[PDB]
Amino acid sequence: MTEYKLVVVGAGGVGKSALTIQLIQNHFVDEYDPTIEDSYRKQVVIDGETCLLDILDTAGQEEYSAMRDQYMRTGEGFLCVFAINNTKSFEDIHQYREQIKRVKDSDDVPMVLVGNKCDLAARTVESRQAQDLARSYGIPYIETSAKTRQGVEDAFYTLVREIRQH
Numbered sequence: 702m703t704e705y706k707l708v709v710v711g712a713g714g715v716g717k718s719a720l721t722i723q724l725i726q727n728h729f730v731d732e733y734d735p736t737i738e739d740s741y742r743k744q745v746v747i748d749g750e751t752c753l754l755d756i757l758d759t760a761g762q763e764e765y766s767a768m769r770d771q772y773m774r775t776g777e778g779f780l781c782v783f784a785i786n787n788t789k790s791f792e793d794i795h796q797y798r799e800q801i802k803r804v805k806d807s808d809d810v811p812m813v814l815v816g817n818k819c820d821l822a823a824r825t826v827e828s829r830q831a832q833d834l835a836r837s838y839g840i841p842y843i844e845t846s847a848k849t850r851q852g853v854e855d856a857f858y859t860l861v862r863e864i865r866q867h
């Protein structure tokens with residue numbers, strides 16, 4: 702069957718693993734469990750198409766940047782995750798996108814911009830600022846909450862559709 706190699710990237714603690722575990726295991730993980738590098742593989746039916754979602758969950762730790770070129774190189778599509786209550790994570794989005802472009806030798810790469818932790822009332826990044834950034838990249842912007850599940854499937858499934866149209 703068709704396989705989609707998805708790679709979740711973003712600064713430490715923005716909820717990359719929480720979003721990936723919500724989608725696969727239907728549970729909100731609220732534990733301190735920094736990620737090194739993990740892979741999830743699950744059969745799903747998306748728009749009637751049988752396909753394998755192969756999702757690599759990456760570390761936000763910079764200690765692993767050699768490990769980064771490698772997985773970014775094999776990825777078909779990317780979820781760039783920042784948190785709506787961490788302005789630095791939003792700023793560090795540029796760095797991840799510009800690394801992806803250089804590892805993929807392409808101006809355009811299937812990608813979705815994800816503003817996570819939207820269940821929290823203490824917001825420091827305005828949805829409009831993120832939307833404007835996404836618009837300049839030419840990619841869609843989706844706000845998610847791993848804790849309530851808002852926009853989770855949407856984020857992942859959309860990315861798959863952007864891969865389909867590439």
Ligand SMILES: Nc1nc2c(ncn2[C@@H]2O[C@H](COP(=O)(O)OP(=O)(O)NP(=O)(O)O)[C@@H](O)[C@H]2O)c(=O)[nH]1
Binds near residue numbers: 719759
């Ligand atoms: N309120 C709220 N907390 C969230 C949300 N997503 C993740 N968190 C919390 O944020 C913390 C970090 O989540 P985690 O998924 O481990 O982040 P990560 O990006 O995978 N970290 P790392 O880069 O180290 O692997 C956890 O305490 C988790 O419960 C969310 O949507 N809402």
Ligand SMILES: [Mg+2]
Binds near residue numbers: 735736
């Ligand atoms: Mg993690």
